[PDB]
Design a binder for this molecule. Sequence first.
Ligand SMILES: *[C@@H]1O[C@H](CO)[C@@H](O[C@@H]2O[C@H](CO)[C@@H](O[C@@H]3O[C@H](CO)[C@@H](O)[C@H](O[C@H]4O[C@H](CO)[C@@H](O)[C@H](O)[C@@H]4O)[C@@H]3O)[C@H](O)[C@H]2NC(C)=O)[C@H](O)[C@H]1NC(C)=O
Ligand SMILES: *[C@@H]1O[C@H](CO)[C@@H](O[C@@H]2O[C@H](CO)[C@@H](O)[C@H](O)[C@H]2NC(C)=O)[C@H](O)[C@H]1NC(C)=O
Ligand SMILES: *[C@@H]1O[C@H](CO)[C@@H](O[C@@H]2O[C@H](CO)[C@@H](O)[C@H](O)[C@H]2NC(C)=O)[C@H](O)[C@H]1NC(C)=O
Ligand code: NAG
Ligand code: NAG
Ligand code: VLN
Ligand code: VLN
Lengths: 390, 392
Amino acid sequence: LDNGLARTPTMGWLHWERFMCNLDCQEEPDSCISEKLFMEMAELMVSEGWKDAGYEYLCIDDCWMAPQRDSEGRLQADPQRFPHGIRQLANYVHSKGLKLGIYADVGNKTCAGFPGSFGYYDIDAQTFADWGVDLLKFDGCYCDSLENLADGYKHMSLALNRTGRSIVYSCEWPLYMWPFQKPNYTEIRQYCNHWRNFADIDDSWKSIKSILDWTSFNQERIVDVAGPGGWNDPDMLVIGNFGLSWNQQVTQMALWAIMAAPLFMSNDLRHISPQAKALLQDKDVIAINQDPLGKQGYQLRQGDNFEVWERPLSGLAWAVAMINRQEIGGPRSYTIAVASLGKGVACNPACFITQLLPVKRKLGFYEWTSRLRSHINPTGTVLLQLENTM
Amino acid sequence: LDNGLARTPTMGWLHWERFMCNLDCQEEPDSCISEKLFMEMAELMVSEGWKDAGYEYLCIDDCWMAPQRDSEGRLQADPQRFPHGIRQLANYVHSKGLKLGIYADVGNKTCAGFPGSFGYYDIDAQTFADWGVDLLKFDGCYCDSLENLADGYKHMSLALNRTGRSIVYSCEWPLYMWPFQKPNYTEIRQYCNHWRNFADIDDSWKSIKSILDWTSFNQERIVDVAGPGGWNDPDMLVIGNFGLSWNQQVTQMALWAIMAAPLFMSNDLRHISPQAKALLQDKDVIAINQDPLGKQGYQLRQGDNFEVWERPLSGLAWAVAMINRQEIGGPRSYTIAVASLGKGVACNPACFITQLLPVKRKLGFYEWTSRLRSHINPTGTVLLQLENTMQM
Ligand SMILES: *[C@@H]1O[C@H](CO)[C@@H](O[C@@H]2O[C@H](CO)[C@@H](O[C@@H]3O[C@H](CO)[C@@H](O)[C@H](O[C@H]4O[C@H](CO)[C@@H](O)[C@H](O)[C@@H]4O)[C@@H]3O)[C@H](O)[C@H]2NC(C)=O)[C@H](O)[C@H]1NC(C)=O
Ligand SMILES: *[C@@H]1O[C@H](CO)[C@@H](O[C@@H]2O[C@H](CO)[C@@H](O)[C@H](O)[C@H]2NC(C)=O)[C@H](O)[C@H]1NC(C)=O
Ligand SMILES: *[C@@H]1O[C@H](CO)[C@@H](O[C@@H]2O[C@H](CO)[C@@H](O)[C@H](O)[C@H]2NC(C)=O)[C@H](O)[C@H]1NC(C)=O
Ligand SMILES: *[C@@H]1O[C@H](CO)[C@@H](O)[C@H](O)[C@H]1NC(C)=O
Ligand SMILES: *[C@@H]1O[C@H](CO)[C@@H](O)[C@H](O)[C@H]1NC(C)=O
Ligand SMILES: NC[C@H]1N[C@H](CO)[C@H](O)[C@@H]1O
Ligand SMILES: NC[C@H]1N[C@H](CO)[C@H](O)[C@@H]1O
């Protein structure tokens, strides 16, 4: 989408995975989907260094709406859970230097059953712009035809444009097309700043494996379309929650950097371990994810329960990730000729290699003839940056 | 097995899950199966508090043997990886106050392809006894006849008996029966101190779930068989390795306590986080696992992606574990009438409830009519101890 936005993958926080559709503010005031939850997350995004690290968009997912539209047929936030309304929440979020994301659905209802936007695309776009919304996640539930799906996503894209406000447009279009018809990613990128390709992530290593495996299986179709203004979205970062071991969290961070993925955390910023916070705020890894060239990485190799992924960066640098998919035993040795990396240019005539994950360690100079040797933890990842000596 | 051993579930360390069959001591010296590894592991078991916590058996799994038997037809340790031999390793282990476990196979070869014990049961038992072995893990590979399997396990049990040395006898008999017919656990318990029921564990939450689900599915068949001298073995503790989140590690520790399981760690004691070590050395949870009553726990309830397990303890106490199997979202509230716990006996007329996991916290007195309310993390477990009481 050539709206001047998302020139690097969008970074921020999205409530869905950790907080979902919790409406029980009477029994669970601190966890329910409410204005107070987003105020608390905004405060911590400022005070705990998230904004400084680049996490900029505080995003509302499903279950913010009132059961019905208002007198004039516009969407409204739930009166009890969002007493001051979305425009006021956006004002607050802006006063902190952050941006606000909101959620709507292309069909007749949202996935959780709240008012859909079909028939209201232009009014909804104008409502969002009037409210000061900075990002829209547009879901695909309750849409009875591929034509309605495509037409709605394009119509909403154009309506957002017509409001004149800069609004990041996040689409689930491909995900809802894939069971029936192969998506045309050139068209999608024409209309969207990023697009969900695959099933919702949850708090599990199985989910991560399945997302990585889908991305590597389909990489010939999706890798080259990505770039400044339009990214593949493999769904939220779930680092800092409950289901991932430390090495599995490292794998998610490293490979979301390799994939030039949007970095939408879905966690509780009020209760997050120092280790998870340091991983999610890792300057060098974020810098890889945010590389201005915006060329998505890809899987280079797979075999012996090892995977090698790599990503070209600005200024002749490369990022390389090595995953150990064997879920038994101990750290496993993996070696690869550096001439096999970076299409044969990264280390010609030589390169300096720095390991970034699981810990930052300079590895030294590697000549064109050299072999890179590493030990990779089960379900963990070794992430490296290669700098050509020219 | 009525050998006076394993009156509580055996506790120790077994190399299989973490170190497997790594034979490459030149390229992977720190991971290969060698005498130096077991010597160092013994030193750390002493110095890092593992022996004090109750972990007593340092156990060798597969891939310790030389490719062939010796001139006298007895087994021998690998010449390069175990130059000083099993007798000397056992001397070292005993000098640290620990006990040594070893591995053999009922069939013609071990699962990794090394000499099997079939045809040599009595001499192999005697060899182990001469070496000073204190525990035998007896595998079931390369034995495709049910009669051979059963006869071999019984024979090895009797042969170990004849040596006159006290040796814990750990069997994989039931697991190897399933391709043919489901086991008679009365017979197995007659011959074994504990027995593997289900597929090998690996370093994953998937594996933990599958072991728990098999145990609860088959619990009417295996729970009452267990007791002092004979335990169900759901395989090694893998806390301290790589594939389990903190809450998944807590779930494994809590439920291995519930199940009266042998506690065999399979990790690297040289590289283990403080948090994992504190969990594995948790005095109160170990005390649940080691409860002298020796009655295995069971799944009480299951529904809405929640599980409730409980285990009766000595002196009218109970352990209760609540698992959240929903792998999305945040901590989920679960409430239960305390009268539903411990068969209505734990809290009659009252009980004092102490949460032990994920953190230790006194919850207070709960009267027989009261309700217990708790919050459980995704893939985590809340482990509680109920003490029957007449007071407030
Ligand atoms: C080879 O097999 C034989 C037969 O199975 C086995 O002999 C058995 O040894 C056990 C353990 O020593 C004996 O059990 C003991 O019996 C005495 C006398 O009745 C009791 O006083 C003992 O009670 C104490 O220990 C128990 C734990 O075992 C506790 O439950 C109890 O509270 C006491 O602390 C204990 O019951 C058993 O009687 C014999 N059986 C026979 C038939 O002789 C022998 O040990 C095996 N070989 C080797 C090397 O162990
Ligand atoms: C509406 O769409 C137009 C057309 O794509 C966008 O115009 C582009 O804006 C970028 C950034 O300002 C320029 O670099 C391009 O040259 C423009 N292209 C064209 C064809 O005009 C415009 O930014 C969009 N406006 C909003 C508010 O989204
Ligand atoms: C995928 O969609 C793109 C964009 O809608 C199609 O490309 C356009 O094709 C028309 C007609 O040939 C050209 O005039 C435009 O210049 C193209 N637009 C762009 C942005 O390239 C493309 O044909 C579609 N591909 C398939 C296989 O259907
Ligand atoms: C919404 O419902 C109407 C009436 O049932 C239907 O005609 C229309 O196609 C639906 N729209 C979508 C996108 O499913
Ligand atoms: C199980 O084994 C015991 C002891 O050997 C024996 O007495 C019993 O009959 C067996 N049960 C069945 C059902 O075969
Ligand atoms: N992919 C389906 C989408 N619908 C849910 C909201 O109800 C989340 O936004 C999820 O990402
Ligand atoms: N269940 C199969 C058994 N065989 C392996 C050794 O090769 C492990 O001991 C495992 O416990």
